[PDB]
Nucleic acid binder design. Structure first.
Ligand code: ATP
Ligand code: CA
Ligand code: CA
Ligand code: CA
Length: 341
DNA sequence: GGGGAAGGATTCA
DNA sequence: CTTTGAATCCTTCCCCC
């Protein structure tokens, strides 16, 4: 099959440039402020002008400002980004009915029935890029290959504002020369476990005892990597349906006082119920981040949908359970809804 | 023995 | 004193449907 993956470039920061054109060419840093003190929080994303200097996703705002004190720092406006995203995703549906929106700035299109070979696929990619740029003024990077994993890898290799095809021969080459830590789904934790087994390339996963691999990184990831190594990886492009929606918020001051936490929890519940919109959850989990950054949760599943009134009384019961089964103080508190009707 | 659901922790991004 | 949303993975346990 032929897969065409679209990845919006430094998306949040690019949208802010689209809304304020004079920002282009200047380092722009979109931040997620937490409210614990002046500039507390981290960078959500930065444009390349900022990344060039080390200011990137994940570094503390305070740190970023030490590197680029005169950069433009903007608060994250997720709603705006989500609406621009939605409009771009609609443009993409016009190129294939088989589309998988993987996130706010990523989507896979199965274009097998639209093009005959990679040359045509490439031309369709330029067409898609021109279209998005024309309608929304947003640049994207297109990756094209035989399956979702290599289509994503192609985009990783070509971003920003690029387009790349990874034909069958290059797939075989990558299976031998690509750093396994660069394979989608393999984060830091897994990359290190793999490194401790002397595995640095997909190909390496074949010449090892399966139970040794499975025992180290889990059965699912082991089978996943081996299938990629056997060039036998296959996963169809399917419509994504979110399976859980929730919100967890950092508090003013750590605590284990029920009456003092209710407000924050109820806040997360109202914001969660807003995002649900029509979706009716049968399950609820209360999640707490401890003073020392540990994450603990308690949940419950009901035989029917959970009205917000039910969510309110039940969340307290679940938070009480955590408070009781854990001596530590809570830093962050939130709720998570799932098992939608 | 193993399907399948539920409760939690882990991992990815 | 870095976010923080969501899927994935690991155990346990019921049940023989
Ligand atoms: N610790 C983290 N590591 C990686 N991604 C994170 C983390 N915390 C949040 N994210 C979310 O992931 C986004 C980064 O994912 P990813 O690396 O796939 O984006 P991208 O398309 O490469 O990046 P960009 O938007 O910066 O151009 C941001 C947000
Ligand atoms: Ca992106
Ligand atoms: Ca992304
Ligand atoms: Ca833990």
């Amino acid at each position: 099959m032929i897969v065409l993956f679209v990845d919006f470039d430094y998306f949040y920061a690019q949208v802010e440039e689209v809304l304020n054109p004079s920002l282009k060419g200047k380092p722009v840093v979109v931040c997620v402020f937490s409210g614990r003190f002046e500039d507390s929080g981290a960078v959500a994303t930065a444009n390349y002008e900022a990344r060039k200097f080390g200011v990137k996703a994940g570094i503390p705002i305070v740190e970023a400002k030490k590197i680029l004190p005169n950069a433009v720092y903007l608060p994250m406006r997720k709603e705006v980004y989500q609406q621009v995203s939605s409009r771009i995703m609609n443009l993409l549906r016009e190129y294939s009915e088989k589309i998988e929106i993987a996130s706010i700035d990523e989507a896979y299109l199965d274009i097998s029935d639209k093009v005959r070979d990679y040359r045509e696929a490439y031309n369709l990619g330029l067409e898609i890029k021109n279209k998005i740029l024309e309608k929304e003024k947003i640049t994207v990077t297109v990756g094209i290959s035989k399956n979702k994993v290599f289509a994503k890898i192609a985009a990783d290799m070509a971003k920003p504002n690029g387009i790349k095809v990874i034909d069958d021969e290059e797939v075989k080459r990558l299976i031998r020369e690509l750093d396994i830590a660069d394979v989608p789904g393999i984060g830091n934790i897994t990359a290190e476990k793999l490194k401790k087994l002397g595995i640095n390339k997909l190909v390496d996963t074949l010449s090892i005892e399966f139970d040794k691999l499975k025992g180290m990184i889990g059965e699912a990831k082991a089978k996943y990597l081996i299938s990629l190594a056997r060039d036998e990886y296959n996963e169809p492009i399917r419509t994504r349906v979110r399976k859980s929606i929730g919100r967890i918020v950092t508090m003013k001051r750590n605590s284990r006082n029920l009456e003092e936490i209710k407000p924050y929890l109820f806040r997360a519940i109202e914001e969660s119920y807003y995002k649900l919109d029509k979706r009716i959850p049968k399950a609820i989990h209360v999640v707490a981040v401890t003073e020392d950054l540990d994450i603990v949760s308690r949940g419950r599943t009901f035989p029917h949908g959970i009205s917000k009134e039910t969510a309110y009384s039940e969340s307290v019961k679940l938070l009480q359970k955590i408070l009781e089964e854990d001596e530590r103080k809570i830093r962050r508190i939130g709720v998570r809804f799932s098992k939608f009707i």
